Design a protein around this nucleic acid. Structure first.
Length: 948
RNA sequence: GCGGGGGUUGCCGAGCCUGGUCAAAGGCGGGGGACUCAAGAUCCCCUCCCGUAGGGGUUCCGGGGUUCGAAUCCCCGCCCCCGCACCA
């Protein structure tokens, strides 16, 4: 009822024994079982959710270890990032919420907290807080191989470097433009986290089509922005806003210089949009009105009409009008007021492509002049003739709308007849400080082109050779290998490894964390050398890492690298001998949320660097976890820490309670009651073993059948379990290995109550041996203990895994047992529906011919006659004839099963007394006298009974 | 919009992939009992409708397709949850 004292007792034992620190020579390679999981991001305390992500790889690491495999399951810490950093400053500024998140939620000694201004202190207190919680939950972790990330772990960064350099040899590293939420303070990116409000506002690509106003001296553009590049061929006039103001200014890019007239604010946004915008003249709004402007794409010209619906803060302000479609084109058109010039109400109305010159939708509702109620009916039309929209215009036709909206915009952008202005869908996007968010273009912005189709095949070509779990995720993965472009593999803030060819740039997290799986492979010997200054980080070069990953074994490259690095040759050989042994990585665990990224980048980077025969061999993912329904939010506070939870329930309980709940990608919900109750059950299990532990290990006994049964179910549960596990199917496993055996055994007991012979002992004592070895992975502590209470040998953790035993199998007795069970059920019902008391009942089974022989034949014609023909052609069977209607009935309930022949004997053997004891009635098997029409007025598996 | 997966009995949640043995695993909630003045706790039993002899009827979102037979396989419809990029 405690185990806290025991838990520790063993973590120390396992630890010191260095039992979970595999040795390659220990076994051949086809025995190895490398397996990893994503190193957490030391930023706080892992909660129950992350708890699960880790148990699973352990549970399997243990399991397979007992299974006889040379298992390797390490763990390290991931810190390359920016949250920690930002967090630091925040507690510095003595932030009320962030401090509450560490003072109450993650509970940190009021004192220690304050020392957080230093990021390294946050990457210190929690690195420690992890390794301890992992070890306090008893993971088969080989700490020999352990390291943290960033430029702070020199040998790793060198590895990471080698990687990225090797990423240019293939040309997967590129530079280019790149939008990104931003804070106009003094400068700072907004990674979808700093925004003090609405961070879900999408990044629209309103492209501006530079219309021409070649009046006075010369040229000047009025770039209107439309999300429908197709409407160009339907321009019928321009739109601006008299009220709001605009400006004239030069706009320079790479070299090309132009002079634009757009919204003041539109200047602002663009000033960041990677273009120097030196102002020149402000307008008043209606100024632009009057002038005409030539439609760039076509050749025609148009007038600049004034409007009220044109939002200034939205895009350039200038909107190309095409009333033939966009229902917002007729709002100001419906002229009636008094402005100035006149005559144009009779301007032709062309149209691109329910009807034609649409307007049966605008007034097809209840719209008067200018109402935002149309802000919807304006994009309702956009969809209809979007998927269903044949093209008809002076230029090329036929193709669908989703084609010109990519034949025009592709052409204009190409001929510089249009440019793209990035702008939000809404205005509610504020920064961390308080400023209003804008968008900026990054020229440099390094990339990793997960686009290059020759690589995006190399990947897809691997994934099919891998293994997925669940398997119903195979799709999602492929699908992602497709819809994936180039990812910005670097930032400017936080910790991480600096780009070996642009120290200004800091390699971001999810980009460096993709092939470390192979660093562990040598992480040991490096901590060895690193341990006592016998390692010069520098000496660890691209040239270096290459020998120990690709370059086949050349005795000299070792000698050559010996001096170059300052490391013994034989130590290098071993290092590479390690990797070559441990890779490929049989499995890689992680949550499902990392499929649409890391899990994937993981396959890519891999196929890009490792000799194919080193490609991942499979991936297993898992669901999230909640807490009493409500989702765990670091901010709301309802979050159970892993450790904080191991403390109030105990590792073994917690551990199993998790697997207990779900498998694969299914989420789980942590409930207090549930866990408490599973706890009691654990104890009952605990105790029980302890008892059976007494029983002498005598053996050689004469077990009755009820014993062969509890022994059959053991065998059953043994097998079913072996499976669920082979397939990371925890919930199931636990249902077999635990809740099953439990139940089956409680019955066996209830079954053989008041009994206790050299045999009932054997069963019980041997059950114990197995049962214990089975839960070993879920609850490794109380088992290392109970394994001791029983005869015991070596650590339980290294104990071979129990596989079904030579027969000991009895589908038959298993069958007979449910039979008697069912009989009981029947009698119980017969009485529950009528009589009262009566000391007894009478019932008879059946016999071959008269019955059974029929059924074991019907079940081989499954028809109606062919059987009846097969039968009447037999004496002592046709002998009843008119009664062989047993075939009719028997037919309308599908075929048969086996023959629980000794049947009546089971109803007899060790059942007779039990049954009567439980039913509290006198049982009389196969009588002679004929009661209520008893005698052979019965069927197989359903004997006839008569109470009274 | 691109895309991934789905809808089950009072609820939560299996089972559908290897159709028939599913009235439908498990849990929770509800109820009766051993209890024995009295909180708790363990175990047993019932919980879709009906039933004065172990039975009968209707069930797995709507409608069809396929089959001797579908919660289970195919199609159309409606509906629901999830990622989209530098953010771990």
């Amino acid at each position: 009822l405690n185990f806290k004292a025991i838990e520790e007792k063993w973590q120390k034992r396992w630890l010191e024994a260095k039992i979970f620190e595999p040795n390659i020579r220990d076994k051949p390679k086809e025995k190895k079982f490398y397996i990893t999981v994503a190193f957490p991001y030391l930023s706080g305390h892992l909660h129950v959710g992350h708890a699960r992500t880790y148990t699973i790889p352990d549970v399997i690491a243990r399991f397979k270890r007992m299974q006889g495999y040379n298992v390797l399951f390490p763990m390290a810490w991931h810190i390359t990032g920016s949250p920690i950093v930002g967090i630091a400053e925040r507690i510095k500024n003595r932030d009320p919420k962030t401090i509450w998140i560490y003072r109450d939620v993650y509970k940190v000694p009021e004192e220690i907290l304050w020392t957080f201004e230093d990021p390294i202190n946050i990457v210190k207190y929690f690195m420690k807080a992890a390794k301890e919680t992992f070890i306090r939950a008893g993971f088969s972790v080989d700490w020999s191989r352990e390291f943290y990330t960033t430029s702070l772990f020199p040998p790793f960064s060198k590895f990471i470097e080698w990687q990225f350099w090797k990423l240019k040899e293939k040309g997967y590293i590129v530079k280019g433009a790149h939008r990104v939420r931003w804070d106009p303070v003094v400068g700072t990116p907004l990674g979808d986290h700093d925004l003090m409000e609405g961070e879900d506002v999408p990044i629209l690509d309103y492209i501006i089509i530079k219309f021409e106003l070649r009046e006075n001296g010369e040229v000047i553009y009025l770039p209107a922005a439309t999300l429908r590049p197709e409407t160009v061929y339907g321009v019928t006039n321009m739109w601006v806003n008299p009220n709001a103001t605009y400006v004239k200014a030069k706009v320079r890019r790479k070299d090309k210089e132009e002079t634009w007239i757009v919204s003041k604010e539109a200047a602002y946004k663009l000033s960041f949009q990677d273009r120097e915008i030196e102002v020149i003249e402000e307008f008043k709004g209606e100024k632009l009105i009057g002038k005409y402007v030539r439609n760039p794409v076509s050749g025609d010209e148009v007038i600049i009409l004034p409007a009220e619906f044109v939002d200034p803060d939205n895009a350039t302000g200038v909107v190309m009008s095409v009333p033939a479609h966009a229902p917002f084109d007729h709002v100001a058109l419906e002229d009636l007021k008094r402005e100035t010039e006149i005559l144009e109400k009779y301007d032709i109305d062309p149209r691109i492509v329910f009807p034609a010159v649409e307007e049966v939708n605008k007034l097809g509702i209840k719209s008067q002049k200018d109402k935002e109620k149309l802000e919807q009916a304006t994009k309702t039309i956009y969809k209809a003739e979007y998927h269903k929209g044949i093209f008809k215009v002076p230029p090329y036709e036929g193709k669908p709308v989703q084609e010109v909206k990519e034949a025009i915009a592709k052409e204009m952008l190409e001929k510089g007849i249009a440019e793209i202005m990035y702008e939000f869908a809404e205005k509610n996007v504020i920064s961390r400080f308080g400023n209003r968010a804008v968008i900026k273009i990054i020229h440099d912005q390094w990339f990793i082109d997960y686009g290059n189709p020759e690589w995006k095949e190399k990947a897809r070509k691997a994934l099919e050779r891998m293994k997925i779990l669940p398997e119903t995720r195979r799709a999602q993965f492929e699908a992602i290998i497709d819809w994936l472009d180039k990812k910005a593999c670097a930032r400017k803030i936080g910790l991480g490894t600096p780009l070996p060819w642009d120290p200004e740039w800091v390699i971001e997290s999810l980009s460096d964390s993709t092939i470390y799986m192979a660093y562990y492979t040598i992480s040991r010997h490096i901590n060895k050398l690193r341990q006592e200054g016998k390692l010069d980080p520098e000496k660890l070069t691209p040239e270096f890492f290459d020998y120990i990953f690709l370059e086949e074994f050349s005795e000299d490259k070792e000698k050559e690298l010996e001096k170059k690095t300052g490391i013994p040759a034989e130590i290098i050989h071993e290092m590479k001998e390690e990797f070559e042994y441990w890779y490929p990585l049989d499995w890689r665990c992680s949550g499902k949320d990392l499929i649409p990224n890391h899990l994937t980048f993981f396959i890519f980077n891999h196929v890009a660097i490792f000799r194919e025969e080193h490609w991942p061999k499979g991936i297993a993912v898992n669901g999230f976890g909640t807490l009493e329904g409500q989702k765990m939010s670091k901010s709301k506070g309802n979050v159970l820490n892993f450790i904080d939870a191991i403390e109030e329930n105990g590792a073994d309980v917690v551990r199993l309670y998790i697997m207990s709940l779900a498998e694969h990608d299914s989420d789980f919900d942590w409930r207090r009651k549930e866990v408490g109750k599973l706890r009691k059950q654990i104890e009952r299990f605990y105790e029980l073993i302890s008892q059976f532990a007494e029983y002498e290990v005598k053996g050689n006994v004469e077990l009755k059948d009820i014993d062969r049964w509890m022994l059959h179910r053991l065998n059953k549960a043994i097998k079913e379990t072996t499976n669920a596990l082979e397939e990371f199917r925890t919930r199931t496993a636990v249902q077999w290995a635990f809740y099953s055996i439990m139940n089956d055994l409680r019955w066996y007991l209830r079954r053989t109550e008041g009994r206790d012979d050299e045999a009932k002992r054997y069963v019980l004592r041997t059950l114990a041996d197995v049962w214990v070895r089975l839960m070993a992975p879920f609850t490794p502590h109380i088992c290392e203990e109970l394994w001791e209470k029983l005869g015991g040998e070596g650590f339980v953790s290294l104990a071979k895994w129990p596989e079904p035993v030579e027969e000991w199998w009895n589908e038959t007795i298993e069958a007979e047992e449910e039979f008697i069970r069912s009989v009981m059920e029947d009698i119980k019902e017969i009485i529950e529906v009528a009589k009262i008391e009566n000391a007894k009942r009478a019932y008879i089974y059946t016999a071959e011919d008269w019955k059974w022989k029929v059924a074991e034949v019907v079940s081989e014609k499954r028809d109606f006659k062919s059987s009846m023909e097969e039968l009447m052609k037999d004496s002592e069977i046709r002998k009843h004839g008119k009664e062989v209607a047993k075939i009719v009935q028997k037919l309308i309930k599908e075929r048969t099963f086996d023959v629980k022949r000794i049947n009546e004997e089971k109803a007899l053997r060790e059942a007779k007394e039990f049954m009567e004891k439980e039913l509290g009635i006198e049982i009389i098997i196969n009588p002679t006298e004929d009661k209520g029409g008893k005698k052979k007025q019965a069927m197989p598996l359903k004997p006839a009974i008569f109470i009274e």
